[PDB]
Design an enzyme around this catalytic site. Structure first.
Site, PDB file in Angstrom:
ATOM      1  N   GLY B  72      16.399  66.795 -38.014  1.00 22.51           N
ATOM      2  CA  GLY B  72      15.210  67.608 -38.201  1.00 22.51           C
ATOM      3  C   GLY B  72      14.836  68.033 -39.599  1.00 22.51           C
ATOM      4  O   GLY B  72      14.015  68.943 -39.751  1.00 22.51           O
ATOM      5  N   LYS B 169       7.348  60.888 -27.317  1.00 19.14           N
ATOM      6  CA  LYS B 169       7.746  59.600 -27.834  1.00 19.14           C
ATOM      7  C   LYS B 169       7.264  58.571 -26.791  1.00 19.14           C
ATOM      8  O   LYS B 169       7.431  58.776 -25.590  1.00 19.14           O
ATOM      9  CB  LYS B 169       9.256  59.608 -27.899  1.00 19.14           C
ATOM     10  N   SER B 199       8.201  47.876 -34.861  1.00 18.03           N
ATOM     11  CA  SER B 199       8.316  48.833 -33.777  1.00 18.03           C
ATOM     12  C   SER B 199       7.040  48.859 -32.906  1.00 18.03           C
ATOM     13  O   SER B 199       5.911  48.702 -33.415  1.00 18.03           O
ATOM     14  CB  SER B 199       8.604  50.219 -34.358  1.00 18.03           C
ATOM     15  N   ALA B 200       7.219  49.021 -31.594  1.00 16.09           N
ATOM     16  CA  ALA B 200       6.085  49.108 -30.685  1.00 16.09           C
ATOM     17  C   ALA B 200       5.924  50.559 -30.259  1.00 16.09           C
ATOM     18  O   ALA B 200       5.217  50.845 -29.293  1.00 16.09           O
ATOM     19  CB  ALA B 200       6.301  48.214 -29.466  1.00 16.09           C
TER      20      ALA B 200
HETATM   21  C1  LIG Z   1       9.099  44.902 -30.874  1.00 17.31           C
HETATM   22  N1  LIG Z   1      10.115  44.277 -30.063  1.00 17.31           N
HETATM   23  C2  LIG Z   1      11.385  44.389 -30.267  1.00 17.31           C
HETATM   24  N2  LIG Z   1      12.160  43.759 -29.327  1.00 17.31           N
HETATM   25  C3  LIG Z   1      13.628  43.780 -29.180  1.00 17.31           C
HETATM   26  O1  LIG Z   1      14.041  45.135 -29.424  1.00 17.31           O
HETATM   27  C4  LIG Z   1      15.279  45.058 -30.124  1.00 17.31           C
HETATM   28  C5  LIG Z   1      15.506  46.331 -30.942  1.00 17.31           C
HETATM   29  O2  LIG Z   1      14.440  46.610 -31.869  1.00 17.31           O
HETATM   30  P1  LIG Z   1      13.293  47.697 -31.584  1.00 17.31           P
HETATM   31  O3  LIG Z   1      12.462  47.229 -30.442  1.00 17.31           O
HETATM   32  O4  LIG Z   1      12.597  47.970 -32.868  1.00 17.31           O
HETATM   33  O5  LIG Z   1      14.107  49.029 -31.168  1.00 17.31           O
HETATM   34  P2  LIG Z   1      13.449  50.379 -30.574  1.00 17.31           P
HETATM   35  O6  LIG Z   1      12.097  50.050 -30.062  1.00 17.31           O
HETATM   36  O7  LIG Z   1      14.449  50.933 -29.622  1.00 17.31           O
HETATM   37  O8  LIG Z   1      13.319  51.451 -31.775  1.00 17.31           O
HETATM   38  C6  LIG Z   1      15.133  43.841 -31.017  1.00 17.31           C
HETATM   39  O9  LIG Z   1      16.420  43.308 -31.368  1.00 17.31           O
HETATM   40  C7  LIG Z   1      14.371  42.856 -30.148  1.00 17.31           C
HETATM   41  O10 LIG Z   1      15.234  42.038 -29.352  1.00 17.31           O
HETATM   42  C8  LIG Z   1      11.274  43.181 -28.448  1.00 17.31           C
HETATM   43  N3  LIG Z   1      11.587  42.441 -27.352  1.00 17.31           N
HETATM   44  C9  LIG Z   1      10.507  42.015 -26.681  1.00 17.31           C
HETATM   45  N4  LIG Z   1      10.646  41.283 -25.574  1.00 17.31           N
HETATM   46  N5  LIG Z   1       9.225  42.317 -27.094  1.00 17.31           N
HETATM   47  C10 LIG Z   1       8.891  43.062 -28.203  1.00 17.31           C
HETATM   48  O11 LIG Z   1       7.715  43.264 -28.457  1.00 17.31           O
HETATM   49  C11 LIG Z   1      10.027  43.512 -28.908  1.00 17.31           C
HETATM   50  N1  LIG Z   2      18.729  65.950 -23.317  1.00 16.75           N
HETATM   51  C1  LIG Z   2      18.488  66.018 -24.629  1.00 16.75           C
HETATM   52  N2  LIG Z   2      18.232  67.230 -25.163  1.00 16.75           N
HETATM   53  C2  LIG Z   2      18.194  67.309 -26.478  1.00 16.75           C
HETATM   54  N3  LIG Z   2      18.204  66.342 -27.370  1.00 16.75           N
HETATM   55  C3  LIG Z   2      18.376  65.128 -26.799  1.00 16.75           C
HETATM   56  C4  LIG Z   2      18.591  64.887 -25.478  1.00 16.75           C
HETATM   57  N4  LIG Z   2      18.975  63.537 -25.274  1.00 16.75           N
HETATM   58  C5  LIG Z   2      18.997  62.983 -26.456  1.00 16.75           C
HETATM   59  N5  LIG Z   2      18.575  63.905 -27.432  1.00 16.75           N
HETATM   60  C6  LIG Z   2      18.504  63.743 -28.863  1.00 16.75           C
HETATM   61  O1  LIG Z   2      17.444  62.854 -29.126  1.00 16.75           O
HETATM   62  C7  LIG Z   2      17.573  62.660 -30.544  1.00 16.75           C
HETATM   63  C8  LIG Z   2      16.878  61.402 -30.892  1.00 16.75           C
HETATM   64  S1  LIG Z   2      16.758  61.164 -32.665  1.00 16.75           S
HETATM   65  C9  LIG Z   2      15.640  62.519 -33.039  1.00 16.75           C
HETATM   66  C10 LIG Z   2      15.269  62.724 -34.518  1.00 16.75           C
HETATM   67  C11 LIG Z   2      14.632  64.106 -34.752  1.00 16.75           C
HETATM   68  N6  LIG Z   2      13.461  64.272 -33.892  1.00 16.75           N
HETATM   69  C12 LIG Z   2      14.284  64.326 -36.229  1.00 16.75           C
HETATM   70  O2  LIG Z   2      13.337  65.108 -36.468  1.00 16.75           O
HETATM   71  O3  LIG Z   2      15.149  64.031 -37.087  1.00 16.75           O
HETATM   72  C13 LIG Z   2      19.127  62.757 -30.935  1.00 16.75           C
HETATM   73  O4  LIG Z   2      19.478  63.796 -31.928  1.00 16.75           O
HETATM   74  C14 LIG Z   2      19.703  63.091 -29.539  1.00 16.75           C
HETATM   75  O5  LIG Z   2      20.904  63.891 -29.547  1.00 16.75           O
END
Ligand SMILES: C[n+]1cn([C@@H]2O[C@H](COP(=O)(O)OP(=O)(O)O)[C@@H](O)[C@H]2O)c2nc(N)[nH]c(=O)c21
Ligand SMILES: Nc1ncnc2c1ncn2[C@@H]1O[C@H](CSCC[C@H](N)C(=O)O)[C@@H](O)[C@H]1O
Ligand SMILES: C[n+]1cn([C@@H]2O[C@H](COP(=O)(O)OP(=O)(O)O)[C@@H](O)[C@H]2O)c2nc(N)[nH]c(=O)c21
Ligand SMILES: Nc1ncnc2c1ncn2[C@@H]1O[C@H](CSCC[C@H](N)C(=O)O)[C@@H](O)[C@H]1O
Lengths: 291, 291
Positions: B72, B169, B199-200
């Site tokens: 945070g 989120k 990221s998506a």
């Molecule tokens: C953006 N994207 C990421 N991935 C998978 O997601 C894994 C982790 O990367 P990320 O999706 O950036 O993680 P997060 O969304 O949890 O922050 C990658 O190693 C890919 O295999 C994805 N896999 C699919 N099928 N489609 C997507 O659009 C896609």
């Molecule tokens: N049940 C829950 N209650 C509180 N925090 C949770 C949770 N499950 C997971 N989390 C928290 O979700 C967080 C995701 S990372 C969050 C980053 C933070 N928002 C920033 O401002 O830096 C982690 O710290 C993890 O412990």
């Protein structure tokens, strides 16, 4: 005699324009005055709900999934009514209890002996696919704990089945038995003629447009209101003899029934709404063996 | 160089007007180009969300409940910003992990070391009563199973806390990892500058009027769309150098940041939007130790 003149009856909860302090002694008073009154109550509400869907053109081609359907005697009347009007519908009646044998032998109606859980809802959804679903729920567990669990299942029925419309059983927990606030689907709180004398039960009617689902929070204050509005309706209103209602029976519930029945479609052409209603009522009472 | 002229950047998911087939090799590409980029990403989105609430007059007097808040670091900046503007807010940061010590010693900010569950949400709701709550959620478990569980908790946060607004989120499960359809609260899908390269993830911003709660169903087809729209944005758009953007840095993310920052309120009066933004950006980067 308790006479009065009324324009229309209260069709929805929101229309109730007065309230009374709930008298617990009311619980000891005669709850029903007609044989098979419960089947009559359900028949009118579901005929009302379904005729509405017909009017909006969303009934034809739908599969009606009725959970909490047994015995379901009155459902045979509903099926015949739409079947005879030419509407094409499939019925799927599910309950752990057994259905009235009058429902057997109809290719358009499937009886299922099962107590539904979220998982089962998923399988039937996969199996109904891709038909449009109309959900009707009358499941019964009652504590406020029981109610919440039922309501929770009803909302899961909608999220899994994803129906085009739904009719759900709805009775707000009593304020003095409040546990926690919760959400019910947004819909019209249809009032029920021939409900038990002091019942606070109504039916929640909803039509699902788009891919959205709107819920509404229910609090204890809402619970206090339901109790007082429904108590006023049951104690005062429903005990009225509407003397400006020219009909064989002028009691409030018949006046209220008249307004629901006037919305029903028939094959026979009638010269007046009064003739159609008398016909539908006669028909309904004969079918249910109500004198 | 990859140059282009743009009027405005895509602020919401719905504005993305093109798509690309997701290339899995993108997962091996550099995810971040700036130190503390994640704090920067969160800071801009939450400054954007909160400034909006200020504009609608619903921030002052609220208790901001941020779940998933640790470490945070960036939250200290947000707190100072509104505190210095004269807005009266209480912050309640809850996470099982520990918060950055820069957050200690502020009477207006309460740090809680707890992993929230539905029951705890109930107790804090009883304890916050009767303040107006603004919920911010960044909890993290990831499988599609993990996501669904997080989303399920986020919806329970809203039903129990019953906030006046919320920032959640939001990253749709990948189509090739689909489990089942589900509901998310209805809100604006705010896009995030400085999100990881591919990221998506976006943030779902909602304001709660009345006692209703509107949800929206998410299906695999939606999942296919999210993937292609976000892939197009990340691969194509975010790699653009907006040459008609007169600013010290013309990369798309700075152009996008500019539009969020232009909505922020300051005590200092500036002769141009460009001066205010440059000021806020300089301020933000200095606070986060970003060169
Ligand atoms: C953006 N994207 C990421 N991935 C998978 O997601 C894994 C982790 O990367 P990320 O999706 O950036 O993680 P997060 O969304 O949890 O922050 C990658 O190693 C890919 O295999 C994805 N896999 C699919 N099928 N489609 C997507 O659009 C896609
Ligand atoms: N049940 C829950 N209650 C509180 N925090 C949770 C949770 N499950 C997971 N989390 C928290 O979700 C967080 C995701 S990372 C969050 C980053 C933070 N928002 C920033 O401002 O830096 C982690 O710290 C993890 O412990
Ligand atoms: C209508 N009403 C009924 N009860 C109680 O409910 C009990 C069962 O009667 P019911 O409420 O008609 O049952 P149902 O709603 O499950 O079909 C009665 O014995 C009463 O104690 C009620 N109790 C409270 N507190 N308030 C009410 O408005 C009320
Ligand atoms: N999980 C569930 N699935 C199916 N039926 C359920 C259920 N839980 C309870 N019920 C049923 O809910 C019903 C309530 S009484 C219903 C009356 C019926 N609608 C009529 O037309 O006659 C009971 O038959 C009960 O077995």
């Amino acid at each position: 005699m308790d006479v009065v003149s009324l324009d229309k009856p209260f069709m929805y909860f929101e229309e109730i324009d007065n309230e009374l302090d709930y008298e617990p002694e009311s619980a000891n008073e005669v709850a029903k005055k007609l044989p098979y009154q419960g089947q009559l109550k359900l028949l009118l509400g579901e005929l009302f709900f379904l005729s509405k869907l017909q009017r909006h053109g969303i009934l034809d081609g739908a599969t009606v999934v009725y959970i909490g359907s047994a015995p379901g005697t009155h459902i045979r009347y509903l099926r015949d009514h739409f079947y005879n009007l030419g509407v094409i519908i499939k019925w799927m009646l599910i309950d752990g209890r057994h259905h009235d044998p009058i429902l057997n032998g109809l290719r358009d109606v499937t009886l299922v002996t099962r107590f539904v859980d979220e998982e089962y809802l998923r399988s039937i959804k996969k199996q109904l696919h891709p038909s449009k679903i109309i959900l009707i729920s009358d499941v019964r567990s009652p504590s406020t704990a029981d109610l919440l669990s039922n309501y929770a299942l009803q909302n899961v029925m909608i999220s899994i089945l994803n129906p085009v419309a739904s009719s759900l059983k709805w009775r707000c927990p009593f304020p003095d038995q409040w546990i926690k606030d919760f959400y019910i689907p947004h819909g019209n709180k249809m009032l029920q003629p021939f409900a038990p004398s002091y019942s606070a039960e109504m039916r929640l009617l909803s039509i699902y447009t788009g891919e959205n689902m709107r819920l509404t929070r229910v609090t204890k204050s809402d619970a206090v209101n339901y109790e007082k509005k429904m108590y006023y309706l049951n104690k005062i209103v429903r005990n009225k003899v509407v003397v400006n209602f020219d009909y064989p029976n002028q009691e409030y519930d018949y006046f209220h029934m008249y307004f629901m029945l006037r919305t029903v479609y028939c094959n026979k052409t009638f010269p007046t709404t009064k003739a159609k209603v008398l016909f539908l009522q006669q028909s309904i009472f004969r079918f249910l063996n109500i004198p």
